[PDB]
Amino acid sequence: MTTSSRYKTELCRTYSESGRCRYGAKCQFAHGLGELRQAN
Ligand SMILES: [Zn+2]
């Protein structure tokens, strides 16, 4: 069963290198590629 929602499916890829960080300081997913649940 696990969580019945869970956050997004993205990940701090190149972002973590001070790039963009769609959620600077608050990033957990939404960022560069982030296609865990779309190719992984
Ligand atoms: Zn980030």
Swiss-Prot record:
Tissue expression remark: Expressed in skeletal muscle satellite cells. Strongly expressed in differentiated adipocytes compared to preadipocytes (at protein level). Expressed in embryonic stem cells (ESCs). Expressed in heart, placenta, kidney, intestine, liver, lung, thymus, fat and spleen.
Transmembrane segments: none
Inducing or repressing factors: Up-regulated during adipocyte differentiation. Up-regulated transiently in response to fibroblast growth factor FGF4 in a MAPK-dependent manner in embryonic stem cells (ESCs). Up-regulated by interferons and/or lipopolysaccharide (LPS) in a STAT1- and p38 MAPK-dependent manner. Down-regulated in muscle satellite cells upon muscle injury (at protein level). Up-regulated by various mitogens. Up-regulated by LPS and TNF-alpha. Up-regulated by interferon IFN-gamma and/or LPS in a STAT1- and p38 MAPK-dependent manner. Up-regulated in keratinocytes during epidermal repair after wound healing.
Location within or outside the cell: Nucleus; Cytoplasm; Cytoplasmic granule; Cytoplasm, P-body
Observed effect of gene inactivation: Mice appear normal at birth, but within 1-8 weeks after birth they develop a complex syndrome of cachexia, arthritis, autoimmunity, myeloid hyperplasia and general inflammation. Show precocious skeletal muscle satellite cell activation and increased satellite cell fusion into myofibers. Show higher levels of tumor necrosis factor (TNF)-alpha mRNA and protein in macrophages and an excess of circulating TNF-alpha. Show higher levels of granulocyte-macrophage colony-stimulating factor (GM-CSF) expression in macrophages and an excess of GM-CSF secretion upon lipopolysaccharide (LPS) stimulation.
PTM: Phosphorylated. Phosphorylation at serine and/or threonine residues occurs in a p38 MAPK- and MAPKAPK2-dependent manner. Phosphorylation by MAPKAPK2 does not impair ARE-containing RNA-binding.
Zinc finger annotations (C3H1-type) as residue ranges: 6-34
Protein function: Zinc-finger RNA-binding protein that destabilizes numerous cytoplasmic AU-rich element (ARE)-containing mRNA transcripts by promoting their poly(A) tail removal or deadenylation, and hence provide a mechanism for attenuating protein synthesis. Acts as an 3'-untranslated region (UTR) ARE mRNA-binding adapter protein to communicate signaling events to the mRNA decay machinery. Recruits deadenylase CNOT7 (and probably the CCR4-NOT complex) via association with CNOT1, and hence promotes ARE-mediated mRNA deadenylation.
Comment, domains: The C3H1-type zinc finger domains are necessary for ARE-binding activity.
Subunit composition and interactions: Associates with cytoplasmic CCR4-NOT and PAN2-PAN3 deadenylase complexes to trigger ARE-containing mRNA deadenylation and decay processes. Part of a mRNA decay activation complex at least composed of poly(A)-specific exoribonucleases CNOT6, EXOSC2 and XRN1 and mRNA-decapping enzymes DCP1A and DCP2. Associates with the RNA exosome complex.
Protein name: mRNA decay activator protein ZFP36
Taxonomic source organism: Mus musculus
Organismal lineage: Eukaryota, Metazoa, Chordata, Craniata, Vertebrata
Full-sequence range covered: 91 to 129 of 319
